[PDB]
Structure 1
């Protein structure tokens, strides 16, 4: 648990919320539904590609389903699983789902273990159901508010998923194809890895004729680690161990 002085968040440009009372104008209903699209799909796919959810939009405008049910059936649609389930591994799917339905990053290793086991056993609908049915969702969004991003100036942050979360709240997030939080929370509990003292991208491929550095602008598989000034890499002798 954290704590924050109330004026520390009252400063600045004020992220805004979208509510879906039936009886609003049509203007507000359209703006609310489009904000929902931007939240769940990271951008308005209705305007860019002409995707549409006719039954869902009419049902949510009339008030037969709430914004929670609308987001729940958006998360288990075919569009969502084509864009954010199929091109990823399950560990990355969990991390992206937490951004899309809770507006935040993974906090703990045990949290990842729990939700990865759920996705493991029950698929995407099971994962989405366990996310939207949680107490935290209702604590932040009770049936009518569109989920928003809980950035830095909005809520007291914890210094444990700081950089990982700030990178999750970027449009470059869907192109980090390697999971970012399971590896980080695993490496907190282990010794330093076997890599160059600088970033992981400073190690070349040991091939016949090389100069190949695969990590870089095109890969985005990058892992800095704190290496002290005094430190010696464990090298493996090309030959018997004992001539090391």
Structure 2
């Protein structure tokens, strides 16, 4: 059949460990763009990217910070916050930073207040800076998504 994943087995989590070599860091940072934005960014974005990429490669900032920066990008707002309902962009924010999705109905509604007040910047800030989520997924590890294929096209 047509899918062409076949044996694309992703247990390989991209952990920015303070003690990685240069090439290893390039992989983890590239994959940070690929996990958060699904890879679809202009390279002429730069400047902010260039700084923060040098910092996470310098071990100045960790991947918890770097992922906040990427999931605070104007592109990541414009593609989800506006064309799609906030509740969907909200689920997507949990589905990225937690690398899985939301679970409790209360949780979804609580952070819905946060996305209604300060938008996706304040939402993603609340998700990464929280001690519980910084403990669960970790601060070195890039949010690798569980995915769970949800694409029932046609209605």
User: Which interval holds the TM-score relative to the shorter structure?
Assistant: 0.7 to 0.9
Residue number among 149, 152, 155 corresponding to 1:167 in the alignment: 149
Which SS does the other structure have where 1:18 is aligned?
A: coil
- Equivalences for residues 39-188 of structure 1 within 5 A: 39-42=35-38, 44-45=39-40, 49-50=42-43, 51-52=45-46, 53-150=49-146, 166-168=148-150, 172=151
Q: Deviations over 1:153-203 (max 9, x none)?
A: xxxxxxxxxxxxx334xxx4xxx8xxxxxxxxxxxxxxxxxxxxxxxxxxx
**Cα RMSD (Å):** 2.2
Higher RCO, 1 or 2 (CA under 8 Å, sep at least 6)?
2
Give the corresponding residue for 1:186.
none
Q: As a proportion of its length, which structure holds more helix?
A: 2
Cα–Cα, structure 1 residues 106 and 141, in superposed 2: closer, same or farther, change >3 Å? closer
Cα–Cα, structure 1 residues 110 and 23, in superposed 2: closer, same or farther, change >3 Å? closer
Q: Distance in 1 between matches of 2:131 and 2:124?
A: 14
| 1:23 Cα deviation from its structure 2 partner | 4.0
TM-score of the superposition, structure 1-length normalised? 0.53
TM-score of the superposition, structure 2-length normalised? 0.80
Which SS does the other structure have where 1:84 is aligned?
A: coil
Q: Which runs of 5+ in 1 are unaligned?
A: 1-12, 152-165, 177-216, 223-244
Q: Which runs of 5+ in 2 are unaligned?
A: 1-8
Q: Based on CA coordinates, which of the two structures has the bigger radius of gyration?
A: 1
